[PDB]
């Protein structure tokens, strides 16, 4: 009766690359797609001084709603699904986010308050306002557009959220709900508000650079908080038999899906990791594979002091001795962190990945830490031969978030 | 497959402080628009000084409304395996209360304006984490914003999970806050016009802010420890309509969950003018003949509480205390056409 | 200062009578990074001067944020 899940469409809006071809080709010659930027240090004053954009005046440009709206329509392409194969009832969608529309709903109150310095004007408050703080914006509006009739969720689990939207399309899938299911995250936090709460925080990198894009450097010595991105990535899941009847091209199984909270801090991660550790053994418990075919990972890596040990200690746990051999990599090096965004992005390229049989390397890799003694494939890639893939995420909340993701 | 029960329920509105308190008056009640903040309440005995400072008032209903709903169920919190105990929530607008002042100073002053504790206030996944830590529960956790349907969908996933066998014990439920200047302001002003494109024109109603949660739990666990187990949740519904077509044959699947049974009470989403002439006509296509009851100008449009907080009154109801009905089902759906429907049934 | 001791008391959550200002704020009173980072915030809010990560890492004790606000 459980059905076997796979990804037999992709659809990316990246730094590193809007579409699937041209995402793929600068993340294997291992091109950063950080970009320097002035308004932050200029206008706010924030010790950053570098963004992951795709492409000082306050714009609500509807970002979050619109690399949604792209990245599904060159999904559905790429999968190749008409209203014709499509049966509405039994295709669903799963759309994350972290802040969903905050660009939108920050634009809004210093509009009202005239530049946040006077009480809130009602009369100034638009119709259209109201749209920007609806989370499932994305999620909805895709629903719409393509006739999606079976359950339509945001999950927004913070940096887990991508994942966790995965995780239950999964589930709709291998329970027999859903047939289809259009899953991912789509984030838009380069405004203001979101990077200043991580800037007053102290996760964002904020050490004086000559290069600005090696500021995301992942299991470096050097790192010092994670360059922030803005990105949007969608995976279509369906069934095994499904996708066979139709005669589909399959990217990777989606085999297993995992969740747990660390019950430590909201924002620190613990040295040890023994919370993820129980998160990557549920996952393999839940796929029914074992650890030994485990030959390649695609981590969080998002470039602080705290998460880089803490994903290295993780995997020597579970692994132990076995742990060295492994691959294992951070798109965030050469992307930056898209939060939600970054889990479906860098699954996008984990499906590309075991397809093409490449592993795309961590680029900025400087002087190597001591803790942080694994193979992380520095600078330049290779061919590789994925078996079975472990994709791990973390997020606010003590979240901890696994897929293992297999060839077909 | 496994068997799902309500074991506790705690809830806090305008209306009352406790399940109880709530429950006698909207029975009472059942015999332009502005927001209903709450009466009589501080959240100082419950919540420590260090952890009330650094969250919102959204996360601080939320965790009053577990203890609660803890206290009801009697579980040994301590002896619980915190592995097997996962915290599902439903919140759409977050905690705007906590950071609006710091978001207009940023403008202003600069990265001065704004201190560290917005990164974690804000989001609506803060109510898990936050959960998490006090109690120490470690097993799947998650937070939908799914608009209105955000903890519909949040307590029919925390069943799925403890069906699948992810859990034993999962606090569900949802919770809101919307006294903050930004929001309160939108509401006003905006939500009385606008109508949806699926389900038509709203009705005359104001909002209500607080928190409603339920402790659901494994069947064989509950009779384990000799709970006193209020109802049986027997079926989830989570669909969506995108045109009027669709809208009509998506609330046939909500008269799937009656099983055919004329001993049932309907509770209905009660925001939209036309949901009583569609939903009776779906039931009349099925033969399903039940009692209509509207609770939404009695609780008001809490958005994520909204259907939560139904479900911890139908609870109630169902646990030995209209006459004498032995189903329960309470239907929901927003404004861009869900359609999320949860079933409960005695003993 | 007085200033300083009410913000610790309250941010830490302490009785103010039974504050100790010589006491380690990381060991005794397990203040994690975030707490700092917000004392930061403030001792910029009421003194009015400059304070970067760099400067406040180095605040060990209730003493250490009183010899900083004086230079
Ligand atoms: C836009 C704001 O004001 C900041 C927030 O509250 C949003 C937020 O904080 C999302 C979040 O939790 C991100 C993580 O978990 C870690 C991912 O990188």
């Not at chain 1, 009202?112 to 009602?122: L, M, Q, R, S």
């Not at chain 1, 291998?174 to 789509?186: E, N, Q, T």
């Amino acid at each position: 009766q459980p059905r076997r899940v796979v990804v037999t469409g992709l659809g990316v809006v990246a730094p590193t690359g809007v579409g699937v071809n041209e995402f793929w080709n600068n993340i294997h010659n291992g091109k950063s797609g950080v970009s320097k930027y002035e308004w932050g240090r200029e206008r706010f004053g924030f010790k950053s001084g570098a963004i992951g954009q795709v492409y000082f005046v306050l714009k609500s440009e509807r970002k979050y709603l619109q690399f949604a709206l792209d990245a599904a329509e060159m999904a559905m392409q790429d999968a190749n699904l008409r209203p014709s194969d499509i049966d509405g009832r039994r295709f669903g969608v799963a759309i994350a986010t972290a802040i969903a529309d905050a660009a939108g709903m920050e634009e809004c109150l210093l509009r009202i308050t005239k530049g946040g310095k006077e009480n809130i004007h009602p009369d100034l408050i638009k119709s259209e306002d109201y749209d920007s703080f609806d989370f499932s914006s994305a999620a909805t509006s895709v629903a719409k557009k393509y006739g999606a009739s079976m359950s339509v969720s945001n999950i927004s689990t913070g940096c887990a959220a991508g994942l966790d939207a995965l995780g239950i399309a999964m589930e709709h899938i291998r329970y027999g709900r859903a047939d289809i299911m259009l899953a991912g995250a789509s984030e838009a936090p380069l405004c203001p508000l979101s990077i200043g709460s991580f800037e007053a925080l102290g996760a964002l990198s904020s050490r004086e650079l000559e290069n600005q894009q090696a500021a995301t450097c992942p299991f470096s010595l050097e790192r010092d908080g994670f360059v922030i991105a803005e990105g949007c990535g969608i995976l279509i899941l369906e069934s095994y038999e499904h996708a066979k009847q139709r005669g589909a091209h399959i990217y990777a199984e989606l085999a297993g899906y995992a969740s747990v909270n660390n019950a430590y801090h909201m924002t620190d991660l613990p040295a040890d990791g023994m919370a993820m550790a129980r998160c990557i053994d549920m996952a393999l418990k839940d796929a029914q594979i074992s650890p030994s075919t485990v030959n390649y990972i695609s981590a969080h890596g998002s470039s602080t002091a705290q998460n880089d040990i803490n994903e290295s200690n993780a995997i020597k746990f579970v692994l132990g001795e076995s742990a060295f051999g492994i691959p294992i990599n951070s798109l965030k090096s050469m992307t930056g962190h898209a939060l939600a965004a970054a889990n479906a992005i860098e699954s996008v390229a984990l499906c590309l990945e075991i397809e093409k049989q490449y592993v795309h390397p961590t680029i900025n890799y400087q002087t190597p830490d001591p803790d942080c003694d694994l193979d992380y494939i520095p600078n330049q890639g290779c061919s590789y031969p994925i078996k079975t893939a472990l994709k791990l995420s973390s997020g606010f909340s003590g979240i901890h978030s696994v897929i293992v993701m297999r060839a077909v | 497959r496994k068997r799902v029960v309500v074991t506790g329920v705690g809830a806090i509105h305008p209306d009352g402080n406790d399940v109880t308190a709530i429950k006698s008056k909207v029975i009472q009640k059942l015999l332009s628009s502005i927001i209903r903040t709450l009466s009589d309440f501080d959240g100082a005995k419950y919540i420590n000084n260090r952890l009330r400072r650094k969250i919102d008032e959204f996360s601080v209903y939320g965790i009053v409304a577990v203890e609660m709903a803890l206290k009801a169920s009697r579980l040994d919190v301590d002896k619980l395996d915190p592995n097997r105990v996962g915290i599902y929530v439903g919140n759409c607008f977050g905690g705007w209360q906590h950071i609006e002042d710091e978001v207009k100073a940023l403008h202003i002053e600069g990265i001065k304006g704004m201190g560290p504790y917005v990164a974690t206030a804000w989001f609506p996944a803060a109510l898990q984490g936050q959960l998490s830590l006090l109690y120490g529960f470690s097993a799947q956790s998650k937070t939908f914003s799914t608009s209105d349907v955000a903890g519909m969908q949040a307590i029919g996933y925390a069943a799925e999970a403890i069906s699948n066998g992810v859990a034993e014990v999962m606090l569900c439920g949802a919770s809101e806050h919307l006294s903050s200047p930004l929001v309160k302001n939108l509401l006003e002003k905006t939500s009385s016009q606008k109508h949806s494109e699926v389900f038509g024109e709203k009705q005359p109603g104001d909002f209500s802010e607080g928190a409603a949660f339920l402790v659901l739990e494994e069947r064989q666990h509950a009779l384990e420890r000799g709970a006193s187990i209020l109802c049986e949740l027997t079926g989830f519904v989570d669909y969506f309509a995108p045109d009027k077509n669709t809208r009509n044959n998506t609330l046939e699947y909500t008269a799937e969950l009656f099983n055919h049974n004329e001993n049932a009470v309907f509770i209905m989403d009660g925001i939209y003018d036309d949901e009583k002439e569609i939903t009776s006509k779906a039931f009349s296509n099925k033969e399903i003949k039940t009692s209509f009851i509207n609770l939404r100008p009695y609780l008001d449009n809490q958005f994520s509480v909204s259907g939560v907080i139904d479900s911890v009154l139908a609870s109630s109801f169902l646990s030995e205390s209209f006459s004498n009905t032995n189903q329960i089902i309470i239907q929901r759906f927003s404004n861009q056409g869900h359609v999320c429907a949860l079933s409960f049934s005695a003993i | 200062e007085v200033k300083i001791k009410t913000i610790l008391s309250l941010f830490l959550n302490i009785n103010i009578d039974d504050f100790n200002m010589d006491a380690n704020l990381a060991d005794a009173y397990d203040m994690d990074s975030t707490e700092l980072a917000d004392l930061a915030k403030e001792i910029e809010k009421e003194f009015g001067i400059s304070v970067t990560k760099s400067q406040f890492s180095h605040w060990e004790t209730g003493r250490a944020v009183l010899d900083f606000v004086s230079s």
